[PDB]
Amino acid sequence: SLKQRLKGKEGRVRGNLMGKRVDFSARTVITPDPNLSIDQVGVPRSIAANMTFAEIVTPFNIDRLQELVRRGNSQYPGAKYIIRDNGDRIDLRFHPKPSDLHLQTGYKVERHMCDGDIVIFNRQPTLHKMSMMGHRVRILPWSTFRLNLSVTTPYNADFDGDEMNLHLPQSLETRAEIQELAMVPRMIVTPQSNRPVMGIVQDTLTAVRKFTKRDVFLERGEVMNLLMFLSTWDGKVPQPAILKPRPLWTGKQIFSLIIPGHINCIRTHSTHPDDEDSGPYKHISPGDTKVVVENGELIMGILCKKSLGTSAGSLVHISYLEMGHDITRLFYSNIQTVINNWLLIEGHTIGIGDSIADSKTYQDIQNTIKKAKQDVIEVIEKAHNNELEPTPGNTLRQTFENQVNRILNDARDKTGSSAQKSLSEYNNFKSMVVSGAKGSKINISQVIAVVGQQNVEGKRIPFGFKHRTLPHFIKDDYGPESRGFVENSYLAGLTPTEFFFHAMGGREGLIDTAVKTAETGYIQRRLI
Amino acid sequence: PYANQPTVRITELTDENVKFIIENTDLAVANSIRRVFIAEVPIIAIDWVQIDANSSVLHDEFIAHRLGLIPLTSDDIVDKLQYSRDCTCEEFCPECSVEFTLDVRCNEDQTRHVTSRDLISNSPRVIPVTSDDILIVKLRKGQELRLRAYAKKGFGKEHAKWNPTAGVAFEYDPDNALRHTVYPKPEEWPKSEYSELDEDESQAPYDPNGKPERFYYNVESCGSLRPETIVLSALSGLKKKLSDLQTQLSHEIQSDV
């Protein structure tokens, strides 16, 4: 029926009035490119030779446009239509002789998409307004979209078979609006939490931390090679920090050339001992902490996520507040290029020598676990002989199992502290954890010391059989190993019964994420 | 402000590898000639196949690919052959090509191996390396194969079928006298083949005013060129690149007025 012809979703009121399907829109995979500015994107030549842009003919661009119309649909930088004043849309593919075509003021050529154009780029789910920023075209050989890395944080992207769309503004008013409203250097700080969204990222952060240590000296050739990559260099070579016995520059001395203008900032490094501001050496800092950027040059301190990432009061935040939106772009690009071209001299890796513990540590960890098991046995036996006293508002099982859980937590904390206690300065796990690039301080202990204690539904492993967890135990066993305590490390490998409990914990942790996406998407749609 | 006087010294010489040592030179020059043994030494190989009848198990583009990777004797007549894009002939001529021919038919019941002994050429200077036999395909009673191929000239930047060498070893400073690499525990590392340390030492003592010299090479060969003409044709090829670039340069700063 007629009222049936205009139903809800996919009717005529909710499926073709506000949500529809547009043209001049492409789609393909994305891959990294550290040699692009944060406001550029890389487009293949098969997409660029397909989408067009109508350009009005004026006596300022008559010769260039008739040259473009000489070559059509065969050479790449060409054109494929001429729209004269009458509305006549002629096609260059079928016209017998092109030379007769004489462009005239008022005509309108349909150009091929060339370098310097402006596009709009978004990712699959659009959550906040940073998930659709205006980029700038730059055309490259192969067939994937190429974009910088510091911009992957707003889009929430990663390069394992992802895809993104682009739309090409056709008019000139829309081009101007996109240019002065939504270009990516204009959306560095967000109004949601008044802090930057783009910071230095995965691989450049680990290297920036090592490049600004107290002892990094560069020769002459390497300093020249690094200065070759600065886009805002005035042309002068600074005087080395060590003139004799031979000239050597320092890491901070080269980094002081990247920092724009004359800004001021004071932060701390993630290993600042809290008892340093108390005694002397408050302004000396034996460990080289308390970053100090005075008058636009690094005087002291190591750089990390607390001082270059996306937090309030960072270096990028201050550079945006004081200098503007067109200098922070150069800041990002220069940091990335210089640090990558030094990293291919310094190198970085991870192996199993970084995952190997020491003899003493292995021994000590075993002892703490043996004592932890002894305590759990005491509590259980004490409860059977009915020597436990429940606490206010606690059942005996509660009181029982929560005391056992507290003992297990204390044992796990001691094992973790022991695992943390033994690392070296050359370790490559500590190098990604300290700089804040990737990882946490518990993965170190899980790889080296103890995996810990599993639990489903927020509680210990339940009795899935009748009064048992598996047919390899005796009934009503309440020990630590019989209800989920994995006492090995990922390196030393797990035993079968522990491999099963680990699978259980992982499974519940895997289901929750599957639910969360749909729930949050729907509620946000309603509210908006 | 001038060049150096490098000195060569050969250690081994076989029909498939050369070991030598280049003293008193710079690292950038000792590496730029390590990339020329691989990429820019010309050689002959098949680059045009046309199949008349293929009733074997492998499809047509499988056999056209196992043919190009067969190495042909390119010893002496690579200098007389033009590049087929430079030669003033048509698509092909005996001045910039060599024509091959294969034609095999299996009639007995026992299976048949189609080796490289079947590639029959017209020029007796370029033949596959047979003077065992590379296998191309096996045939069953009632199957056959016949084709025609031409063999052009190129180097290893086009395609990896035109490079003349297997693995090319290279190394310098066998003991960390310069500390170019930093060992965390210098005791677990095996001692190099070229080292001169004692049996109970790990590294030489650090010396700051040092510089890398005395590079060690080891160039093997796949079978096309002798292992000592791979080197002579590389140095004579790199020299002719700079010598041609100096022409274009002086032609630029002369036309500056």
Partner: protein
């Protein structure tokens, strides 16, 4: 044109608008014979 039986591999010219069967074998699956215009490949 010319067709090849699917069992005995005996070529037999089948005329336009004619039933599809072999001869000497009585079979109903035919494969068309390979063309005679030549195409060239690259060893690359």
């Amino acid at each position: 044109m010319i067709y090849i039986c699917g069992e005995c591999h005996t070529e037999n010219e089948i005329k336009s608008r004619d039933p599809i069967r072999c001869r000497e074998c009585g079979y109903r699956i035919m494969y068309k014979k390979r063309t005679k215009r030549l195409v060239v490949f690259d060893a690359r």
